[PDB]
């Protein structure tokens, strides 16, 4: 992560400026949204690794002692 | 079912590009909507087909014995 100033031309010019500033603010807000999205993706990756590790650890440690004891006796 | 500044020429080309972009989007949407129409037609046919089969199979399962019991 010539001078043709007229009440309808000025509206068009001002509205074109408004359109540009509108998509400027939209781009800024969108980028601020992708920042949080990147954050959520990073926690997704970290917790994927953590949860697979805990799944392996729970599949092992619950059954480890009684399996090695049966291997020995 | 004569004002040849680069900025002005770039603005002209950008407006043209905007129009061609929206045209291409409309052209893609038309064929997407054609496929949607085909799927909608298939759903209208299959609704009637499935309700008909729902009635017909139930009747075929049960009437063969219910009519025999009515005759008995």
């Amino acid at each position: 992560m010539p001078l043709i100033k007229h009440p309808e031309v000025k509206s068009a010019i001002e509205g074109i400026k408004y359109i540009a500033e509108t998509m400027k603010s939209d781009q800024e807000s969108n980028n601020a949204a992708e920042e949080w999205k990147y954050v959520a993706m990073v926690m997704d990756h970290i917790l994927l690794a953590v949860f697979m590790l805990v799944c392996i650890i729970g599949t092992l440690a619950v059954f480890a002692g009684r399996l090695i004891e049966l291997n020995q006796q | 079912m004569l004002i040849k500044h680069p900025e002005v020429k770039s603005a002209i080309e950008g407006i043209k590009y905007i129009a061609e972009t929206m045209k291409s989007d409309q052209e893609s949407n038309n064929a997407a909507e054609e496929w949607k129409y085909v799927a909608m037609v298939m759903d209208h046919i299959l609704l009637a087909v499935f309700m008909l089969v729902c009635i017909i199979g139930t009747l075929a399962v049960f009437a063969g014995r219910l009519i025999e019991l009515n005759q008995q």
Binding site: I13, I16, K17, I19, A20, M23, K24, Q27 | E7, V8, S10, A11, E13, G14, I15, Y17, I18, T21
Partner: peptide, 23 residues
């Protein structure tokens, strides 16, 4: 003339935004 330059820059900006979204 400055008023024309400002709207020219605005039009260029809204063209570049569309090019960004198409990439």
């Amino acid at each position: 003339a400055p008023e024309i330059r400002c709207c020219v820059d605005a039009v260029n900006f809204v063209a570049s935004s569309t090019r960004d979204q198409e990439a």
